[PDB]
């Protein structure tokens, strides 16, 4: 009942509409800082010399962008991996030109989202729950760390981190393909299997449970009113659902254990997205997708093109055009 124990008791209270927690104490300010800076920059930041060549890129709405083309632009290549807080700039004018706001946003964000993950652990403990939802969220969290931190570190500049904008995202992923052939990388291929398969199993699960709802309503009511929040009885018939899906394929390709079914739902996209985050994270150190360029040749030695050579042609058009003013020498090594 001393001042400190009372603060502790409110921080960790399960009666707060939004749970705060000790992780929340770091999460709330870092997320407010990132959010406010992002919004203000997206609307009004002046143009930013992303690639260090005094060729500024306009990112914000007031400087001629729409929602699709707008971005908060990565910080200057002249800065590389150096720390560029506001108080290191001679003026905000300078900080704005060199892309200062990007660093402020991505650092406060990566911190607050890390604490978001731990906040998910923390409230699970306060509620008497099992603990591993945060493990599920480490797959998206790791993917954001990969594109905003790991890839910058390996290539040596935050100017090659992912821009905070729709079209800037597409620019980042085109340049990535040109330089790493992410499409021919198996960890990206496993990401596609994770997100395609997770979309599949979402639709499967949702259609199978919806298919086996027990009749509780009339045809004038939404069927959803046949379930009441916190009723003890299940609302669908899993054995009917199993009896349908097992005949659609065969018996043993259908789950009859709801626990292993939902574990499977959790694990497939989580693991696929760990791998694709690990793909970005290892292409950061330039271990790139398979290279089958000119791998097939004929008895004389002529090259026989495959589809990989055709991929290579497109990759080359992407390479030679990107950052078209920023290279003075013939190899783009970072």
């Amino acid at each position: 009942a001393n001042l400190w124990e009372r603060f502790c008791n409110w921080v960790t209270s399960t009666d707060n509409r939004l749970y705060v927690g000790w992780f929340g104490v770091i999460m709330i300010p870092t997320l407010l800082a990132a959010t406010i800076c992002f919004v203000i920059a997206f609307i009004a930041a002046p143009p930013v010399d992303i690639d260090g060549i005094r060729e500024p890129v306009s990112g914000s709405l007031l400087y001629g962008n729409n929602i699709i083309t707008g971005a908060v632009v990565p910080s200057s290549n002249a800065i590389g991996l150096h720390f560029y807080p506001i108080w290191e700039a001679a003026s905000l004018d300078e900080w704005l030109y060199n892309g200062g706001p990007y660093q402020l946003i991505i650092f406060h964000f990566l911190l607050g989202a890390s604490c978001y993950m731990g906040r998910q652990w923390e409230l699970s403990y306060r509620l008497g729950m099992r603990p591993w939802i945060c493990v599920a969220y480490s797959a998206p969290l790791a993917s954001a760390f990969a594109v905003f931190l790991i890839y910058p570190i390996g290539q040596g500049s935050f100017s090659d981190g992912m821009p905070l904008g729709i079209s800037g995202t597409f620019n980042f992923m085109i340049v990535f393909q040109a330089e790493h052939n992410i499409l021919m990388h198996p960890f990206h291929q496993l990401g596609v299997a994770g997100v395609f398969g997770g979309a599949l199993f979402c639709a499967m699960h949702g259609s199978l449970v919806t298919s086996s709802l027990i009749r509780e309503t009339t045809e004038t009511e939404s069927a959803n009113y046949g379930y009441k929040f916190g009723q003890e009885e299940e609302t669908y018939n899993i054995v009917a659902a199993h009896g349908y899906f097992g005949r659609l394929i065969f018996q043993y390709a259908s789950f009859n254990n709801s626990r292993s079914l939902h574990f499977f739902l959790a694990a497939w996209p989580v693991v696929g997205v760990w791998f694709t985050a690990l793909g970005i994270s290892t292409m950061a150190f330039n271990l790139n997708g398979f290279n089958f360029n000119h791998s097939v040749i004929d008895a004389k030695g002529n090259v026989i093109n495959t589809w990989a050579d055709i991929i290579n042609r497109a990759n080359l058009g992407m390479e030679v055009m990107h950052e078209r003013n920023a290279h003075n020498f013939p190899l783009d090594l970072a």
């Binding site: 018996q251 004929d298 008895a299 004389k300 002529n302 026989i304």
Partner: protein
């Protein structure tokens, strides 16, 4: 929860199963091998051998460029090798 067929676990741990299938499995493998090692696969499907993508002094693809004369075009390219 069975429909009356014999269980797989019972079939593949069975002596009779493996007496039949220690013959059939390697025989089909050997068939498949011969299909390629003899050359038949090339002639059946029309797939160029490593020496017959191009004529000796030729670096032009023999692309089909006609819909109803395509069959004959391919034949003409093939004879530009003999």
């Amino acid at each position: 929860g069975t429909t009356g067929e014999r269980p797989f676990s019972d079939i593949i741990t069975s002596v009779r199963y493996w007496v039949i299938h220690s013959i059939t499995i390697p025989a089909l493998f050997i068939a498949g091998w011969l299909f390629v090692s003899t050359g038949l696969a090339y002639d059946v499907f029309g797939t160029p051998r490593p020496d017959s993508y191009y004529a000796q002094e030729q670096r032009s693809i023999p692309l089909v460029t006609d819909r109803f004369e395509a069959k004959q075009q391919v034949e003409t390219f093939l004879e530009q090798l003999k």
